Amino acid sequence: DDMHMVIRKWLSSSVPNHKQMGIIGAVTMMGSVALECDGQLSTLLDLVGFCCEQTPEVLALYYDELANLIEKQKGNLDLQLLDKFGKSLVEDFPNDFVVDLSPTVDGSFLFPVKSLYNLDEDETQGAIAINLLPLVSVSPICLSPCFRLLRLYTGEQNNGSLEEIDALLGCPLYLTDLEVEGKLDSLSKQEREFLCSLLFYALNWFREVVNAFCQQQDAEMKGKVLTRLQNITELQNVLGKCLAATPGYVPPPALQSYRPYFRELDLEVFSVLHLGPAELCFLLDDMCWKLEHVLTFSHLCQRSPKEVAVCVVKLLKPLCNHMENMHNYFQTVNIQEYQLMSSCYHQLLLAFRLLFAWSGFSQHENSNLLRSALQVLADRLKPGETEFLPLE
Secondary structure, three states: OHHHHHHHHHHOOOOOOOHHHHHHHHHHHHHOOOOOHHHHHHHHHHHHHHHHOOOHHHHHHHHHHHHHHHHHOOOOOOHHHHHHHHOHHHHHHHHHOEEOOOOOOOOOOOOOOEEEOOOOOOOOOOOOEEOHHHHHOOOOOOHHHHHHHHHHHHHHHOOOOHHHHHHHOOOOEEEOOHHHHOOHHHOOOOOHHHHHHHHHHHHHHHHHHHHHHOOOOOOOHHHHHHHHHHHHHHHHHHHHHHHHOOOOOOOOOOOOOOOOOOOOOOHHHHHHHOOOHHHHHHHHHHHHHHHHHHOOOOOHHHOOHHHHHHHHHHOHHHHHHHHHHHHHHHHHOOHHHHHHHHHHHHHHHHHHHHHHOOHHHHOHHHHHHHHHHHHHHHHHHOOOOOOOOOOO
């Protein structure tokens, strides 16, 4: 009763500071049923809805709270209890964001709506699309939290996430013509600020979907993932020239100045390396930025440094194959390609030093991990047959 009272008091508190802590405590309390349980939960969620039904940012934090809850203890979460609280999203999401994809879309938008980036579905589900342009003018901020929770719930209900949300991967996106990026001066700080926000939201949506679908491996899925990665790098290249003409801008809470505003990239994404130069440079930059902090940001901190180390060591073979390809190219050997390859090489070596300089290898418990990594490198040198050779 005391906990419920303090949670309700914080929910009704006028100062926004710590009001988010109310929803944090609410999801923490709901975690207690993660083995008449529904009554107190219903009262708490009624209070939360009353105190945040008109707050979009609070709704975003609420969805993120469920996402973190499912991610943390998704192994043995109760299916029926989770469904009884989360059944609303199945109707909430497509009714809000899943718009019709008819070609007769019209309105008072600043730029025309074009169905860019048609997926592998050649008109199979043309009536389904993500109408971001009418939505910006259900709020824009909450899209990727809601998609994250939908993905996690579908993974809970069904082992393969394809059976529920398979059509979402190849959907088009409502956007204007990229050629307008050349005529930036025509914007006059009226259209430029409008389209900057839209470009950020498009990048965040693409990051969310590639984060969702990359871990699951199926026939032809990986090609769609790689094409989406190409779409991300093309959009980022457009955004660079766009933001070059913006003296200042404040993006939503969610060219490395805009690093923290992007959606966090899951550590499973680097399983994709098992590709052009731009995508490889982008992924390696993300990996190096993570290892520069962990081994010397909310999602990867959930797991210990030992888990990060074993996950990184699992990927050592494709890195070696890439390095050998770089060596062959440079021996055999286009200013842009030369710069890209030099950056990739410098990103490959920095990752190597950050792995091997990990202080935790001083302790004796991690002898097997270091022996395995050195075994991989030695097997890369010779034909094989390490046979558990001596350390020297």
